Design a protein around this motif. Structure first.
Motif, PDB file in Angstrom:
ATOM      1  N   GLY A  34       0.868  -1.359   0.019  1.00  0.00           N
ATOM      2  CA  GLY A  34      -0.122  -0.061  -0.111  1.00  0.00           C
ATOM      3  C   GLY A  34       0.927   1.470  -0.008  1.00  0.00           C
ATOM      4  O   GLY A  34       0.371   2.222  -0.737  1.00  0.00           O
ATOM      5  N   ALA A  35       1.861   1.518   0.765  1.00  0.00           N
ATOM      6  CA  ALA A  35       3.193   2.402   0.435  1.00  0.00           C
ATOM      7  C   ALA A  35       2.681   3.787   0.097  1.00  0.00           C
ATOM      8  O   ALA A  35       3.321   4.379  -0.725  1.00  0.00           O
ATOM      9  CB  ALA A  35       3.928   1.564  -0.755  1.00  0.00           C
ATOM     10  N   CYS A  36       1.777   4.232   0.954  1.00  0.00           N
ATOM     11  CA  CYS A  36       1.277   5.942   0.869  1.00  0.00           C
ATOM     12  C   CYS A  36       0.785   6.339  -0.709  1.00  0.00           C
ATOM     13  O   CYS A  36       0.619   7.370  -0.687  1.00  0.00           O
ATOM     14  CB  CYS A  36       2.442   6.784   1.594  1.00  0.00           C
ATOM     15  SG  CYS A  36       4.071   6.768   1.463  1.00  0.00           S
ATOM     16  N   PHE A  37       0.032   5.329  -1.089  1.00  0.00           N
ATOM     17  CA  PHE A  37      -0.891   5.671  -2.071  1.00  0.00           C
ATOM     18  C   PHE A  37      -1.977   4.301  -2.417  1.00  0.00           C
ATOM     19  O   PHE A  37      -3.122   4.544  -2.500  1.00  0.00           O
ATOM     20  CB  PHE A  37      -0.327   6.072  -3.434  1.00  0.00           C
ATOM     21  CG  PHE A  37      -1.547   7.062  -4.366  1.00  0.00           C
ATOM     22  CD1 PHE A  37      -1.842   8.189  -3.963  1.00  0.00           C
ATOM     23  CD2 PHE A  37      -2.017   6.190  -5.377  1.00  0.00           C
ATOM     24  CE1 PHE A  37      -2.830   8.847  -4.856  1.00  0.00           C
ATOM     25  CE2 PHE A  37      -3.009   6.928  -6.274  1.00  0.00           C
ATOM     26  CZ  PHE A  37      -3.565   8.282  -5.824  1.00  0.00           C
ATOM     27  N   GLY A  38      -1.321   2.951  -2.695  1.00  0.00           N
ATOM     28  CA  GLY A  38      -2.445   1.758  -2.491  1.00  0.00           C
ATOM     29  C   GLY A  38      -3.112   1.616  -0.891  1.00  0.00           C
ATOM     30  O   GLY A  38      -3.975   0.468  -1.101  1.00  0.00           O
ATOM     31  N   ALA A  39      -3.048   2.367  -0.148  1.00  0.00           N
ATOM     32  CA  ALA A  39      -3.912   2.491   0.996  1.00  0.00           C
ATOM     33  C   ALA A  39      -4.634   4.045   0.961  1.00  0.00           C
ATOM     34  O   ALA A  39      -6.255   3.945   1.403  1.00  0.00           O
ATOM     35  CB  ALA A  39      -3.245   2.120   2.297  1.00  0.00           C
ATOM     36  N   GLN A  40      -4.185   4.964   0.459  1.00  0.00           N
ATOM     37  CA  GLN A  40      -4.962   6.282   0.246  1.00  0.00           C
ATOM     38  C   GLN A  40      -6.126   6.141  -0.691  1.00  0.00           C
ATOM     39  O   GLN A  40      -7.213   6.795  -0.438  1.00  0.00           O
ATOM     40  CB  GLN A  40      -3.807   7.288  -0.471  1.00  0.00           C
ATOM     41  CG  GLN A  40      -2.532   7.822   0.591  1.00  0.00           C
ATOM     42  CD  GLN A  40      -2.259   9.233   0.396  1.00  0.00           C
ATOM     43  OE1 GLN A  40      -2.944  10.199   1.015  1.00  0.00           O
ATOM     44  NE2 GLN A  40      -1.288   9.403  -0.135  1.00  0.00           N
ATOM     45  N   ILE A  41      -6.258   5.401  -1.774  1.00  0.00           N
ATOM     46  CA  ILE A  41      -7.382   5.019  -2.630  1.00  0.00           C
ATOM     47  C   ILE A  41      -8.330   4.028  -1.906  1.00  0.00           C
ATOM     48  O   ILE A  41      -9.351   4.305  -1.726  1.00  0.00           O
ATOM     49  CB  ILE A  41      -6.821   4.098  -3.968  1.00  0.00           C
ATOM     50  CG1 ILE A  41      -5.578   2.947  -3.679  1.00  0.00           C
ATOM     51  CG2 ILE A  41      -6.238   5.223  -4.977  1.00  0.00           C
ATOM     52  CD1 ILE A  41      -6.273   1.730  -4.035  1.00  0.00           C
ATOM     53  N   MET A  42      -7.725   2.759  -1.338  1.00  0.00           N
ATOM     54  CA  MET A  42      -8.415   2.037  -0.521  1.00  0.00           C
ATOM     55  C   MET A  42      -9.478   2.764   0.559  1.00  0.00           C
ATOM     56  O   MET A  42     -10.766   2.072   0.907  1.00  0.00           O
ATOM     57  CB  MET A  42      -7.587   1.171   0.053  1.00  0.00           C
ATOM     58  CG  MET A  42      -8.126  -0.132   0.749  1.00  0.00           C
ATOM     59  SD  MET A  42      -6.591  -1.192   1.610  1.00  0.00           S
ATOM     60  CE  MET A  42      -7.455  -2.596   2.060  1.00  0.00           C
ATOM     61  N   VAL A  43      -9.197   3.691   1.176  1.00  0.00           N
ATOM     62  CA  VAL A  43     -10.077   4.606   1.987  1.00  0.00           C
ATOM     63  C   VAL A  43     -11.422   4.967   1.324  1.00  0.00           C
ATOM     64  O   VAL A  43     -12.548   5.050   1.824  1.00  0.00           O
ATOM     65  CB  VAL A  43      -9.049   5.734   2.485  1.00  0.00           C
ATOM     66  CG1 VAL A  43      -9.745   7.212   3.018  1.00  0.00           C
ATOM     67  CG2 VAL A  43      -8.229   5.408   3.718  1.00  0.00           C
ATOM     68  N   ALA A  44     -11.256   5.550   0.108  1.00  0.00           N
ATOM     69  CA  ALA A  44     -12.567   5.770  -0.856  1.00  0.00           C
ATOM     70  C   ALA A  44     -13.438   4.480  -1.214  1.00  0.00           C
ATOM     71  O   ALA A  44     -14.540   4.473  -1.557  1.00  0.00           O
ATOM     72  CB  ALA A  44     -12.234   6.358  -2.071  1.00  0.00           C
ATOM     73  N   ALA A  45     -13.108   3.134  -0.789  1.00  0.00           N
ATOM     74  CA  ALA A  45     -13.641   2.040  -0.733  1.00  0.00           C
ATOM     75  C   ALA A  45     -13.465   1.190   0.371  1.00  0.00           C
ATOM     76  O   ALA A  45     -13.333  -0.157   0.494  1.00  0.00           O
ATOM     77  CB  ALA A  45     -13.716   1.346  -1.928  1.00  0.00           C
ATOM     78  N   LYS A  46     -13.484   1.690   1.671  1.00  0.00           N
ATOM     79  CA  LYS A  46     -13.154   0.818   3.079  1.00  0.00           C
ATOM     80  C   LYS A  46     -14.270   1.420   4.196  1.00  0.00           C
ATOM     81  O   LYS A  46     -14.977   0.690   4.763  1.00  0.00           O
ATOM     82  CB  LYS A  46     -11.837   0.981   3.327  1.00  0.00           C
ATOM     83  CG  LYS A  46     -11.370   0.532   4.793  1.00  0.00           C
ATOM     84  CD  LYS A  46     -11.593  -0.984   5.100  1.00  0.00           C
ATOM     85  CE  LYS A  46     -10.885  -1.446   6.288  1.00  0.00           C
ATOM     86  NZ  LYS A  46      -9.539  -1.396   6.582  1.00  0.00           N
ATOM     87  N   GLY A  47     -13.988   2.884   4.374  1.00  0.00           N
ATOM     88  CA  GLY A  47     -14.996   3.516   5.109  1.00  0.00           C
ATOM     89  C   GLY A  47     -15.513   4.886   4.471  1.00  0.00           C
ATOM     90  O   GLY A  47     -16.505   5.437   4.624  1.00  0.00           O
ATOM     91  N   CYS A  48     -14.294   5.663   4.190  1.00  0.00           N
ATOM     92  CA  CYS A  48     -14.630   7.194   3.664  1.00  0.00           C
ATOM     93  C   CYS A  48     -15.548   7.323   2.295  1.00  0.00           C
ATOM     94  O   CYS A  48     -14.858   7.625   1.448  1.00  0.00           O
ATOM     95  CB  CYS A  48     -13.043   8.033   3.804  1.00  0.00           C
ATOM     96  SG  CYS A  48     -13.690   9.556   3.807  1.00  0.00           S
TER      97      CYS A  48
END
Length: 48
Positions: A34-48
């Motif tokens: 995820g490496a400070c962008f493949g978890a920044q995206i994942m936010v927009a389909a996890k809770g936010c």
């Protein structure tokens, strides 16, 4: 403009995208890294 009450919680979610990025790059988030962008995206389909 776009977010005001939905602030820090949703940003905090990309704060978790930090600890994605400091330590490890072959089983972070099982994508792999995820490496400070493949978890920044994942936010927009996890809770936010």
């Amino acid at each position: 403009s776009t977010q005001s009450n939905k602030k820090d919680l949703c940003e905090h979610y990309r704060q978790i995208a930090k600890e994605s990025c400091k330590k490890g790059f072959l089983g972070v988030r099982d994508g792999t890294a995820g490496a400070c962008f493949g978890a920044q995206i994942m936010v927009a389909a996890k809770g936010c």
